Amino acid sequence: LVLAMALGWANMLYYTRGFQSMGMYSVMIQKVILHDVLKFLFVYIVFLLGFGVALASLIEKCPKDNKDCSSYGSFSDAVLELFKLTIGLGDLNIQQNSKYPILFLFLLITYVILTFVLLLNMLIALMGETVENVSKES
Amino acid sequence: EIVQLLMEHEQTDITSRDSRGNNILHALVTVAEDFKTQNDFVKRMYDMILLRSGNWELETTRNNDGLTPLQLAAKMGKAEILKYILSREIKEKRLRSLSRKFTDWAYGPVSSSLYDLTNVDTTTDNSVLEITVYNTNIDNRHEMLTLEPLHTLLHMKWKKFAKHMFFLSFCFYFFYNITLTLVSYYRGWLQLLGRMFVLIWAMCISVKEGIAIFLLSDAWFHFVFFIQAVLVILSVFLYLFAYKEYLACLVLAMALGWANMLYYTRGFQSMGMYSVMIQKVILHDVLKFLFVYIVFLLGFGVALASLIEKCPKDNKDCSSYGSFSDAVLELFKLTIGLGDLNIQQNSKYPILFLFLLITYVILTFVLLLNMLIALMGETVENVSKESERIWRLQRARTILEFEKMLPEWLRSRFRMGELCKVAEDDFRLCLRINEVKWTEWKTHVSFLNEDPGPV
Amino acid sequence: EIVQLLMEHEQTDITSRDSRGNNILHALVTVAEDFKTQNDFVKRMYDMILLRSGNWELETTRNNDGLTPLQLAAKMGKAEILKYILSREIKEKRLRSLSRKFTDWAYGPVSSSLYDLTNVDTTTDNSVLEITVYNTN
């Protein structure tokens, strides 16, 4: 049910075609989600699936009677923490259950910096392609 | 006028090679800076001098460097003269042989021009195309490779084999790094087989990278691949022995390996320009931000730590920003949004602490803002053009690399061009390009095939 | 000049439909790439050939695909020729019928032009407007 409902409102964007301003706005959303954002998302997903297995392998040491000590334990949990971390929700911290906390921290900081420059470049390519394109082609 | 007089005189020797080996045409190639500078007289004098001597002697001579003027106009960054040479439609029936561009049939606006490929294709040593692609000294190679026969050769070589070899190498590297990730995540039989395949393929990559480095910001990728293979072989070596630091050698390759898959984003045009933009940005703009941010970290951290010179007094939790490392870490949290901004209780001057920290936030903000400014200012008319100009150039380099990898018989199979009889007693390789032109109408007098159609 | 000579000759058949069904005007529509490429001679020859034959026959014929040259200049992406066709103000009182743009009154700078809608409106099947809108090619 809800997966239709949540989709239904997203389809109301269709009926934004009436207004000229809102119509160009919605078509810009469509062209952007088709052209530029998928590039960012594919690279970000492969970075997630690459750094997550690493950070999880560093936690190969068992939780030793405490699951709270074992953060980044499951691969899913580590990918989730990285998705928290790109936004600002996570809890960056030096690990105690790992064997190489310095390498953990280094990989995590490099992940942040790569996500940042990747965001920066999607912004660049966006600004470069949109001029004389989204003003007219929209 | 004096050139006519010198050429008309009997004693004159047009084939006179100077101390450097260069004849007159070589000299004209060395003196062909550009159009905006010269107004294009060197091309006309090349035409004049070569038509006054109806022979292949001058373009056939090699200087002491071992180069024809065609190869010299490519090694040197001379584009107008090369465009003239590679595209020549001479009307005189006597001097038809000296041409390199021939129209074998035209019924109307349609016309199938027939370029020549003697010393342009990669069959001969140090050909024109190898010279254009395998040198960085010029910084004009986009104007060089947009010339017609070279451009169509690269497209045909892509359409035939290089696409498949590129996708094939991508698949091998894909399975390689996925086996590496399965190993790193689950760390006996499958593990042993995967480790064996990894050790096999890593040696190949290492040898390729070593040969490429010995033969030598376009080659950074080779260095990074070599670092990856080195780390992988070190890890597989240390796994047999009872060392602990093998795993640190493993993931640091794995995490690097996926970052090297950006390399194989060069295939897609959009993704290729995107990856080259990443490279140019991480080289040009981001390092400026990072150096300033690092010195700000190392400057404000010692300050904020010195304010905590008061001891933790029986509670480490009270002592935040105690160690310099902890303070730098809290500042790196704070620029993102992860930290916990708060008034300190273990300090002697909390107001000064808060002021320094707020100034740090504001300076980081304006620094981010200015990297964004300089980025937007430099990228316009740069990343839209220079991205493609670098991408297509990397593609030409890779295409010629894969063509160099193949053996002789597959080259002879995929040898582009068709043999044609350009003039009576001449049989030569040529390339057929069909063109449609509506502006210039004329009677097609010069043409090879009387029957205008494909056969 | 040769077109004048061919048209003047009595034996010539302007309505000659080729193997594909296309008469001369269809052919001109297939050969009307753009302005920057051709310098706009096809429009003039369309005008010439259609005024040399003061009839609706040529624009009325349908090819084997089932299309008039007006519909073909829309299915194919030919804009200059279509702008010519849909907007025609012929001065000759004899050949006034062949026009599609008419000025029913003008007192000064004001002028009320009167375009035509026979095969442009959606009344007829596969009209010009449907052809323009319902193709992405």
GROMACS .gro file of C-alpha atoms in nm, chain B residues 56 59 88 95-102 114-119 415-431 448:
model
   35
  194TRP     CA    1   5.856   1.202  -5.384
  197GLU     CA    2   5.904   1.405  -4.847
  226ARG     CA    3   4.585   1.715  -5.076
  233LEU     CA    4   5.123   1.592  -6.073
  234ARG     CA    5   4.837   1.367  -5.959
  235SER     CA    6   5.082   1.124  -5.799
  236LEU     CA    7   5.199   1.372  -5.534
  237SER     CA    8   4.847   1.391  -5.387
  238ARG     CA    9   4.737   1.200  -5.077
  239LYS     CA   10   4.362   1.273  -5.089
  240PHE     CA   11   4.176   1.129  -5.387
  252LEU     CA   12   4.023   0.840  -5.051
  253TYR     CA   13   4.299   0.930  -4.805
  254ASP     CA   14   4.640   0.762  -4.788
  255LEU     CA   15   4.795   0.560  -4.505
  256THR     CA   16   5.156   0.484  -4.599
  257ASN     CA   17   5.338   0.641  -4.303
  553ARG     CA   18   4.475  -0.389  -4.076
  554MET     CA   19   4.247  -0.100  -4.163
  555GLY     CA   20   4.224   0.042  -4.512
  556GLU     CA   21   4.185  -0.103  -4.860
  557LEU     CA   22   4.443  -0.132  -5.136
  558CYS     CA   23   4.366   0.097  -5.429
  559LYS     CA   24   4.526   0.197  -5.757
  560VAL     CA   25   4.555   0.574  -5.714
  561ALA     CA   26   4.739   0.632  -6.041
  562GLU     CA   27   4.878   0.411  -6.315
  563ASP     CA   28   5.160   0.186  -6.161
  564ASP     CA   29   5.078   0.284  -5.800
  565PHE     CA   30   4.903   0.052  -5.558
  566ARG     CA   31   4.872   0.180  -5.204
  567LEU     CA   32   4.670   0.144  -4.887
  568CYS     CA   33   4.392   0.400  -4.856
  569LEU     CA   34   4.094   0.492  -4.639
  586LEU     CA   35   3.939   0.757  -6.042
   0.00000   0.00000   0.00000
